[PDB]
Design a protein around this ligand. Structure first.
Ligand SMILES: *C(=O)CCCC[C@@H]1SC[C@@H]2NC(=O)N[C@@H]21
Ligand SMILES: *C(=O)CCCC[C@@H]1SC[C@@H]2NC(=O)N[C@@H]21
Ligand SMILES: [Zn+2]
Ligand SMILES: [Zn+2]
Lengths: 671, 671
């Protein structure tokens, strides 16, 4: 931020380390954009219709119309299911004016909330609140939408009521128009406070959801029946919702079921219905077409280059499948197809992060992994070292889901099943064998917490013989911190003081890391994806942007060879003076490469399940009973105990006080 | 087949050269098949029904069937659209028994015709008739389908009549049962004789097809109106078709048009309808869903891994969308999903051959490149130098279609527009200039033949100002070959002599080269994909199947770099013993400069648009202007005489007669 002495450090560091394999070439997605009249002010519609009509009038207007609306999910959910949620502000912010000035007929644009809040701090290192202001400033004539999880505003644990109230108030203040609300399980009493808080402020609209799972049409279905959804919808409506919505996380909604459900909901109630689904199993446009022929009022689709597979159905097909008929959307097909090149180039830039899933898969009807989780789950598996064992990770996922009854696997309760499956695969015990003797097994902390009822009762009922056996003897007790004196009063002010308090109350570690990083180098939200992820080439010049009236040029001419043990140096050019920098190689240098022997087959040896940090506590001898805990292993968003399958003695222990461990080498030996 | 000495030569030769670069570790796709007893005969399927009811009654039975029929195109079109057309018969033959014993409710399997005949001769050196015989032997309870082009048959240009009749008789004698007659430019006159030839066999269903183009429900333009298709269907029905079809090569059939088009046809003619469509724009299952709600009786699908984008919609989606409803398909979703592992492994094996698109696109409404042509066209463009300029030709394709009297484009009439577009991306001139003054701009040997009238006449009509100017003053010399007296007598006999005669008549040069290879290396259709394509690795096991009752085990040990002698020496084990072998080093020995001098700054520099063998007829002096043919540049199936620049004086020709030159070089200089 301060001149270039600080940013150059980060650039040199990322250039030297750069944990990626080669690079094909440099792309500039900006170079492929249409030509229009940015100078002229944008048209109006679909946003001013709420400020001069009223939050309740908007629902009446939307329901009584012959044209079906559209929402663009390209901004949060499209890249969450394909690129593992690694799209920066620079990127999907230069095209916002084009979308505003070229497609005024949009109903809204889903841009905020979801899993982006975590990542923005943890990985991309940029204040989330800044993105929202810029997006609002760029699209001043279309309503924005948010995703909310009831009492788990953004996270995986219940939060106090005051925090949720302050968060909704602040989000409305900075700018939002539609709030989508859902709960992990289908329990209304766990999301009532959010609805009440949204209604209190007026202006913004409330919109409750009802997660979908199973299959209605199947005669054998007896848990997630139609009456279940009807009663849930009745509770939603009488709670005070302005709208009703359906969320299909995985894409298990078929045409006939959608027709029946939408018809019943429209018949029994007089509120607009909003739809949403991922396109994993195949072509899901049939569901939308069948739905809007019997009711419904809106749909969700993303750009064609980022559509299909795990992401959502394309928008061009939606527009083209209802033209020249009573359901004419109003958008222009030529207008909406003029931006595909930009999104295609943008996707081409994010090659290394593209985990995704190459093509349709008909096996999603078995494991039911929701979209928007395959990419992140694959990244997590790759990190732990179990990368190329993903057919074994899907089977364990299905088994774990089956053993626990039948859960509504959505964002908060999907981490539980994912972690349980990873633990089962890493250890070596199959899911069906976990239920028989869940005593000599290391349950991760999150899974154990779920079994204590901290996320509400499941809709099917607890497993009677499994819950009791897996909880006895694990010391079920943990206190919680509270807002003592200052955070209570800070959450009442408005400005850039409540935002910091919210950030620090939601994620302490990420936020302090982000503060330290920003204090070390400076603001880094004005760079391109290449400059931030890959670093610097040689010879070619770069354009670094900081602020209006400020611009700098950087260039790389040579890189010094790795010194014996001193340091590595690089030289850059800020148009002159060939300013050098000093950086260190955390990968080129290698220590003594002699890992401890890894032994298998012998029943009297203790390995490590997956890679991580081990803090072993044990003494020589000290006869250990079967199933007793020995050491704890901690990894990214995970922590599990490790137990000795067979009783005996300790004999030899060969592990440092605290050090990383391979897939598994040796922890303790028993006889 | 062989004795080992010959096959070893082929393996050693392929191990050297092998332009494909580094490859991952070996993988066996044959280890992921289901488990079941392969000794019981497959259940009774649809071939028995066809034999019992005859060709006529089968159509009547299909007409009054509530269940919607299904077809499997994984064998012919799924790998034609995605993986060029390279799928050796060895891979396919290993899953046919499982498909026959697991999914006996399929209507038919499309596994021959269209474009396999040529590639299976000149690239994958094997005999198509043997592949057909093997596939028939594998599946004795499912009808086999074929794509026939009427006069063209399986070639590109017209063929005499006795050849087509003999071809049909041989094909129906060797196993095929269901033919799909279609013509590029919709006119019953062209394809009338083929229908009569098919009907004379006695048991073979003639399914005529009508192409779809433009849009039906849009009132904008009225050329391809509903009346046009109604008249065409009337003509087809009066011709004597057994079943009516609707081939949608590009994938431009939307729901609102589809329902009307199908409903109108069901209320006049009592024939069944069969629909075919690609999945290029987006989710195309909506078209099927809206079609069988109106009276459609069949649809085409494909294996889930080889589905989406340019291929047909997934088969599992088709089975699921019609499950537990009145239009039940009959298949079992559990059984279908059990074969995906094999297909995905197989696609992983054929990784080097990959063409098409990475994600769904919405701009197919602009260029309208048929599905099943973009892949085989990308491979054609790479070999001519144009490998990265694959987006700049979309506007050229659109222009070529527009200037030429909007028309229908299937394989014979789309090979012409593609050639024109490829030639128009050479010198650098645009479509509008070409239409303005066609005389100056040169024309390929395919477009000229189309304009002459050898192919037909579009429904729109020959453009007046263009045709008369693009024919006169150029030439017209297209002689016709005559059948040898001793050759025609052979076509009246059944067996293998007729098969060889047909092979020579349809494709002379590929047949000669295939015979040469057969003499040189013996049979090679029993090898696996890895061995045939790539070669051999370092010390390992290679289970090689030579023929019945012999399983030669082979393994490479050491390759000796050529120190002085250009020849290389490789030693290969054969049942324990060792045997040196000698192979050439064609790739290694390559050293030749080339002065391109293709700069566009100074006119008069005639540059070869693409790479190939160029013949020059102009000598020193003899100054000429434009229009006159200067050199007959030739390349992969594309005789395109090069244009002529403005007049001047011919001084230096930097090329000898024939000679080799690459795209972007200098052929003749004038001034
Ligand atoms: C760190 O990267 C946070 C966890 C990743 C996001 C998780 S994966 C499981 C949930 N589903 C989803 O879409 N996001 C959540
Ligand atoms: C030479 O044989 C090249 C491969 C075959 C080309 C095929 S013919 C059918 C498709 N249409 C087209 O234009 N090319 C494809
Ligand atoms: Zn979603
Ligand atoms: Zn096709």
């Amino acid at each position: 931020a301060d001149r270039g002495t600080k940013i150059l450090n980060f650039l040199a560091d990322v250039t030297v380390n750069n944990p990626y394999g080669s690079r094909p070439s440099t792309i500039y997605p900006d170079d492929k954009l249409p030509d229009l009249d940015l100078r002229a002010a944008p048209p109006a519609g679909s946003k001013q219709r709420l400020v001069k009509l009223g939050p309740e009038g908007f629902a009446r207007w939307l329901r009584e119309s012959a044209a079906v609306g559209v929402t663009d999910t390209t901004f949060r959910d499209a890249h969450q299911s394909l690129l593992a949620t690694r799209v920066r502000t620079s990127g999907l912010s230069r095209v916002a004016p084009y979308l505003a000035r070229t497609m005024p007929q949009l109903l809204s644009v889903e841009c905020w909330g979801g899993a982006t809040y975590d990542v923005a701090l943890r990985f991309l290192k940029e204040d989330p609140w800044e993105r929202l202001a810029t997006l609002r400033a760029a699209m001043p004539n279309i309503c924005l939408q948010m995703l909310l999880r009831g009492r788990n505003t953004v996270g995986y644990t219940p939060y106090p009521e005051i925090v949720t109230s302050a968060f909704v108030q602040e989000a409305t203040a900075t700018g939002i128009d539609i709030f989508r609300i859902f709960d992990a399980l289908n329990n209304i009493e766990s999301m009532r406070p959010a609805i009440d808080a949204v209604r209190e402020t007026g202006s913004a609209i409330a919109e409750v959801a009802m997660c979908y799972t199973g299959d209605l049409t199947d005669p054998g279905e007896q848990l997630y029946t139609l009456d279940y959804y009807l009663k849930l919808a009745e509770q939603i409506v009488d709670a005070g919702a302005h709208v009703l919505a359906i969320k299909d996380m995985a894409g298990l909604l078929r045409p006939p079921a959608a027709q029946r459900l939408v018809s019943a909901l429209r018949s029994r109630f007089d509120l607009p219905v909003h739809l949403h689904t991922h396109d994993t199993p195949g072509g899901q446009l049939a569901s939308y077409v069948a739905a809007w022929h019997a009711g419904a009022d809106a749909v969700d689709g993303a750009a064609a280059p980022l559509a299909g597979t795990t992401s959502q159905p394309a928008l061009s097909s939606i527009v083209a499948a209802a033209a020249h008929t009573e359901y004419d959307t109003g958008l222009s097909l030529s207008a909406v197809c003029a931006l595909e090149p930009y999104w295609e180039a943008l996707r081409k830039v994010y090659a290394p992060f593209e985990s995704g899933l190459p093509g349709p898969t008909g096996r999603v009807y078995h494991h039911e992994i929701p979209g928007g989780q395959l990419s992140n789950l694959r990244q997590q598996a790759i990190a732990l070292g179990l990368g190329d064992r993903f057919e074994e990770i899907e089977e364990a996922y299905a088994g774990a889901d089956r053993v626990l009854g039948r859960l509504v696997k959505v964002t908060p309760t999907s981490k539980v099943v994912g972690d349980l499956a990873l633990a089962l695969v890493g250890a070596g015990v199959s899911a069906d064998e976990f239920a028989s003797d869940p005593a000599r097994f290391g349950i991760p902390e999150s899974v154990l917490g779920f079994l204590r009822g901290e996320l509400g009762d499941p809709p099917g009922g607890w497993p009677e013989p499994l819950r009791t056996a897996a909880l006895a003897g694990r010391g079920a007790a943990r206190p919680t911190a509270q807002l003592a004196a200052d955070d209570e009063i800070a959450l009442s002010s408005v400005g850039a003081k409540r935002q910091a308090t919210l950030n620090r109350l939601l994620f302490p570690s990420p936020t302090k890391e982000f503060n330290e990083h920003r204090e070390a180098y400076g603001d880094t939200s004005q760079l391109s994806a290449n400059q931030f992820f890959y670093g610097l080439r040689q010879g070619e010049e770069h354009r670094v942007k900081l602020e209006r009236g400020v611009e700098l040029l950087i260039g790389l001419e040579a890189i010094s060879e790795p010194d014996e043990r001193g340091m590595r140096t690089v030289m850059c050019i800020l148009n002159g003076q060939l300013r050098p920098v000093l950086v260190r190689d955390r990968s080129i240098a290698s220590a003594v490469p002699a890992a401890e022997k890894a032994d298998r087959g012998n029943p009297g040896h203790i390995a490590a399940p997956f890679a991580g940090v081990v803090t072993v506590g044990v003494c020589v001898g000290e006869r250990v009973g079967a199933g007793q805990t020995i050491a704890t292993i901690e990894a990214m968003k995970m922590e599990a105990p490790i137990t000795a399958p067979v009783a005996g003695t300790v004999e030899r222990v060969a592990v440092s006080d605290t050090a990383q461990v391979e897939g598994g080498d040796l922890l303790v030996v028993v006889s």
